[PDB]
Ligand SMILES: CCCCCCCCCCCC[N+](C)(C)[O-]
Ligand SMILES: CCCCCCCCCCCC[N+](C)(C)[O-]
Ligand SMILES: CCCCCCCCCCCC[N+](C)(C)[O-]
Ligand SMILES: CCCCCCCCCCCC[N+](C)(C)[O-]
């Protein structure tokens with residue numbers, strides 16, 4: 063049972079919170095690690111499900127949809143609801159709908175950082191950061207071929223091959239690939255993915271490593287991404303009935319594609335005991351295009367106050383008729399990143415030091431060629447009741463273009479010291495960023511520009527007791543430039559994150575147990591809010607606060623029993639906002655929790671059989687920033703049966719059956735507003751056969 | 756009125772384009 067010591071010992075090492083390889087108890091912030099072994103056991107559809115058992119994340123906010131890996135960490139999402147996702151310590155920099163995803167089959171691990179981490183990464187969400195690690199060429203040869211078949215016509219064929227080219231293993235390669243096909247939960251919606259990952263390592267000695275990393279993915283269809291009202295999902299229609307969980311409000315000819323290409327490397331060289339150099343670089347090109355009709359709530363919803371079609375209807379039919387809009391989109395983006403680090407280890411008497419000095423540079427360019435449908439651009443949908451829609455016939459009466467060229471670039475210089483005095487470890491660091499943006503509206507012929515200069519720092523202490531108990535404290539900061547323009551025609555100043563945290567990490571050297579506790583106060587200042595003088599323009603100066611308690615526990619109970627689990631208390635509130643002061647932001651539950659357990663038989667006739675089951679609980683959340691309605695709580699149960707084929711003379715090979723949402727519960731995952739609700743995932747049953755040679 | 760993916764409920768032909776997606 064490889065997942066057992068992986069979740070408890072291999073997962074003690076991390077680099078995401080410090081950019082140095084530091085054990086988790088020596089990191090003065092909250093961090094969680096999901097290994098490839100845990101991902102091989104659980105078989106998560108995406109990286110988000112891989113984090114289901116870690117605290118302080120909302121991995122299921124969007125329900126059945128699997129288009130993006132959006133995460134709500136400690137009550138917060140990135141500026142413009144973009145992902146804040148990293149790959150091999152470099153940002154997968156996105157813009158508008160052009161955001162990249164990495165299939166969990168291609169990953170070695172995923173590490174999640176909670177709270178502000180600008181001190182090492184530059185502009186970042188106050189909530190946190192996700193960093194994924196690509197599968198690397200292995201020492202021992204690997205010859206894996208995998209097959210999947212499940213519910214909603216799911217079909218997958220994968221392969222994972224690695225070996226040395228020479229006898230000394232100084233040249234090694236890896237090649238991981240997959241082809242997936244399935245139907246979305248929603249009728250007429252399909253998903254397709256073809257991904258390949260070529261990798262090459264050059265290891266001339268035990269002190270040098272140059273690894274070429276590339277990723278190529280093509281998705282002709284990414285599936286459902288629509289919106290549905292609280293009327294027919296959370297609440298029943300006037301009828302008293304609700305819409306089915308497979309309900310699709312789009313057009314029969316809705317299409318949505320994505321294409322990704324990346325090349326880069328990871329370099330590290332150790333000169334001596336004092337100095338180590340690191341460099342990470344990536345060039346990536348991302349494309350997306352969609353023709354999507356989608357929902358905009360019922361005609362009795364204030365969002366549809368200017369809709370003619372809605373105004374025409376009787377006040378007895380408004381409550382069960384659905385107003386719809388549309389988006390036609392075509393995007394091409396190019397992204398480049400280089401992070402260069404010098405690591406200096408030395409002592410000053412009784413104090414040992416690990417000094418990190420680095421230069422980080424990223425540039426992103428995104429070219430948007432879109433068309434939007436406004437009020438009365440698509441016919442109403444009677445919710446008491448699928449045909450094609452003309453996307454090419456763009457009517458000047460109700461639709462218009464959106465052609466933008468977005469540019470971003472950021473340079474950061476940063477210093478960090480991990481100074482160890484006996485059992486006292488002090489982490490202190492600072493970063494200086496020059497973040498510059500430039501947006502060309504090709505229709506209006508106008509360019510909006512803003513150059514930001516920002517300083518962030520982090521100061522922490524960990525007291526290392528010999529028994530494995532490690533209390534810690536930290537202050538940490540983040541900044542995020544705005545992309546929005548005020549009444550006065552200028553881009554707004556950045557938003558900032560300021561966090562205080564106290565916690566205790568229980569990481570004993572002699573037991574397979576990882577238990578952490580953390581209490582925090584995270585504040586987002588210069589948040590955009592409604593104009594008090596009333597206009598179609600926002601005003602800066604707003605504030606959001608999140609205070610909470612987070613508990614994670616991971617232990618090997620017996621030789622056959624493994625447990626993973628978490629609990630989160632999140633108290634999020636608008637402390638300063640024109641419209642919502644005192645309210646709780648939408649899609650943020652007060653209470654969340656999860657618990658998983660697995661049993662592996664090692665001696666009788668059931669030798670090599672793993673049985674596992676886990677439950678994920680989400681408390682109630684608010685469905686809108688006005689806090690006019692609530693989304694009800696839910697508990698989802700997953701289960702798996704896995705059998706090692708070693709007893710049948712095929713060691714390394716296994717067959718498994720996964721069941722997600724075992725009791726097939728019907729629930730609304732969340733609502734971001736009265737017109738934007740998402741049905742949770744219906745029961746899924748999957749069979750996987752993975753063979754080693 | 757902010758950043759996002761989907762134009763706000765008030766966005767039209769003669770209106771500046773702001774988002775809520
Ligand atoms: C992207 C920067 C890459 C720089 C490549 C230079 C690394 C030198 C590796 C040589 C290590 C020592 N030795 C004995 C095998 O020659
Ligand atoms: C049973 C092993 C076969 C698994 C299927 C492998 C498919 C390779 C994917 C090709 C995708 C290439 N590209 C560049 C368009 O993304
Ligand atoms: C192994 C290092 C490879 C570096 C090669 C540099 C990339 C070439 C950039 C030029 C591409 C420009 N364009 C528009 C002609 O495609
Ligand atoms: C960005 C500035 C970083 C430079 C920091 C320099 C501190 C180096 C201290 C050397 C330690 C001396 N010694 C010989 C006792 O190891």
Ligand SMILES: CCCCCCCCCCCC[N+](C)(C)[O-]
Pocket residue numbers: 419420475476477494515
């Ligand atoms: C890793 C060492 C880097 C050195 C840090 C130097 C950056 C300071 C530059 C700030 C420019 C001054 N200011 C605020 C007037 O723009």
Ligand SMILES: CCCCCCCCCCCC[N+](C)(C)[O-]
Pocket residue numbers: 477478479490491492519520
């Ligand atoms: C590696 C050491 C460099 C980072 C030092 C941490 C900076 C703390 C300075 C606090 C600045 C506060 N204030 C309001 C005066 O700007």
Ligand SMILES: CCCCCCCCCCCC[N+](C)(C)[O-]
Pocket residue numbers: 421473475496497498513
């Ligand atoms: C060894 C450290 C290297 C320092 C790198 C200097 C970064 C400063 C670049 C600022 C970008 C300039 N500007 C005006 C376009 O924002």
Ligand SMILES: CCCCCCCCCCCC[N+](C)(C)[O-]
Pocket residue numbers: 488489490521522523535536537560
């Ligand atoms: C030397 C590292 C020890 C941890 C120090 C943490 C102290 C918190 C700093 C207070 C932050 C106040 N302020 C206004 C600058 O944000």
Ligand SMILES: CCCCCCCCCCCC[N+](C)(C)[O-]
Pocket residue numbers: 529530531566567568570577578579613
């Ligand atoms: C809910 C807070 C999370 C941290 C849990 C604290 C675990 C402390 C365990 C102490 C065990 C002592 N022993 C047996 C190693 O000597």
Ligand SMILES: CCCCCCCCCCCC[N+](C)(C)[O-]
Pocket residue numbers: 535560562564583585607
């Ligand atoms: C071990 C030291 C514990 C320090 C805890 C103190 C938390 C203070 C929180 C400050 C809140 C201020 N503000 C305006 C950012 O919300």
